[PDB]
Amino acid sequence: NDLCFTNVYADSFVIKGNEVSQIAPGQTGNIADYNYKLPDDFTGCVIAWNSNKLDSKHSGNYDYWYRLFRKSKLKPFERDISTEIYQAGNKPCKGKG
Amino acid sequence: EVFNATRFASVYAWNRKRISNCVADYSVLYNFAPFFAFKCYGVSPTKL
Numbered sequence: 602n603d604l605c606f607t608n609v610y611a612d613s614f615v616i617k618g619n620e621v622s623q624i625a626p627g628q629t630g631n632i633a634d635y636n637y638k639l640p641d642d643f644t645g646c647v648i649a650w651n652s653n654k655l656d657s658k659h660s661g662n663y664d665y666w667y668r669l670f671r672k673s674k675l676k677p678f679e680r681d682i683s684t685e686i687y688q689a690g691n692k693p694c695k696g697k698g
Numbered sequence: 699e700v701f702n703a704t705r706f707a708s709v710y711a712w713n714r715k716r717i718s719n720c721v722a723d724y725s726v727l728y729n730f731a732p733f734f735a736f737k738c739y740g741v742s743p744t745k746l
């Protein structure tokens with residue numbers, strides 16, 4: 602409460618339990634590499650509280666999404682909304698399977 | 699041949715294979731498994 606900040610950014614996203622421990626400056630994993638990477642010299646703080654009442658229901662819910670397939674790592678504080686099938690081998694294949 | 703094995707030994711007897719006289723491309727290593735922990739100490743995995 603005793604410091605004056607030039608700007609504050611609030612990035613929010615639902616994520617699984619272990620990837621909460623994944624979220625930290627200088628880390629590794631499918632989320633810290635392809636979905637969200639924090640800067641190594643991060644000046645900020647993280648918040649995580651459980652929510653089983655708004656992200657759950659009978660018969661289930663599958664609205665949420667995450668990426669494990671990207672051409673390269675995510676440089677810090679970049680968003681990569683794109684649906685491109687990851688190439689395997691040498692095929693220009695565009696589809697699932 | 700190290701990633702395509704079927705009998706990865708138990709931790710009490712850690713199988714130790716030696717890799718010599720070959721060209722190391724780790725793209726096959728990336729492709730051949732949906733990694734869970736690529737955490738590396740001695741080298742940066744991108745610069746491998």
Ligand SMILES: *[C@@H]1O[C@H](CO)[C@@H](O)[C@H](O)[C@H]1NC(C)=O
Pocket residue numbers: 701702703
């Ligand atoms: C193991 O080898 C077979 C040989 O055709 C290959 O098709 C398969 O993808 C390999 N799988 C793993 C898990 O190593």
